């Protein structure tokens, strides 16, 4: 693949069936089997990318609870609370850490899930 | 701070305490049924 000039999983995703089945020993099938793993491999790593800071995955759900902002989503998403399931597990002090976020405010956002998540 | 005033409060104002998960209300209430006594009194 490399030595007939694709270097990135975008190209493989992309780029004309043509092309990739005038490579020697690709078939119409193994081509589109290719391409669907390249997809599949693109939507991953956005999601583990939007997942770990707070780009759509935690900017949709940990974001959920009224009050988040998306630096405070991120915050939560690098403890490891990515989703608004996740912050309504947690306690006051397991966020108490948080650079701008009051006791208050955690208990707040806390309660705000555990009522979408528990009582939605 | 005591037994008397944990049996008063609703489920639904302990939910509202800080630092009080899910699971630190289902450890207060199997600990409460343990001794007969029930949330709500």
């Given at each position: 693949l490399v030595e007939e000039g694709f270097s990135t999983l975008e190209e493989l995703a992309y780029?004309?069936?043509?092309?990739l089945l005038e490579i020697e020993g690709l078939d119409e099938p193994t081509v589109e089997a290719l391409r669907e793993r390249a997809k599949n491999a693109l939507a991953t790593i956005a999601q583990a990318q939007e997942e770990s800071l707070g780009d759509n995955k935690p900017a949709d759900d940990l974001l959920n609870l009224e009050?988040?902002?998306?630096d405070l989503a991120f915050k939560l998403a690098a403890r490891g609370v990515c989703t608004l399931e996740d912050?309504?597990?947690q306690?006051?002090?397991?966020?108490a850490d948080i650079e701008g976020l009051?006791?208050?405010?955690?208990?707040?956002?806390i309660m705000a899930a555990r009522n979408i998540c528990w009582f939605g | 701070h005591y037994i008397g005033d944990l049996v008063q409060r609703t489920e639904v104002e302990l939910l509202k305490t800080?630092?009080?998960?899910?699971?630190?209300l289902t450890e207060?209430?199997?600990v409460?049924?343990?001794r007969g006594l029930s949330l709500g009194m």
């Open positions: 780029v004309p069936m043509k092309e009050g988040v902002d998306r912050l309504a597990e306690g006051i002090d397991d966020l009051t006791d208050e405010k955690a208990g707040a956002l | 800080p630092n009080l998960g899910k699971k630190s207060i209430k199997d409460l049924a343990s």
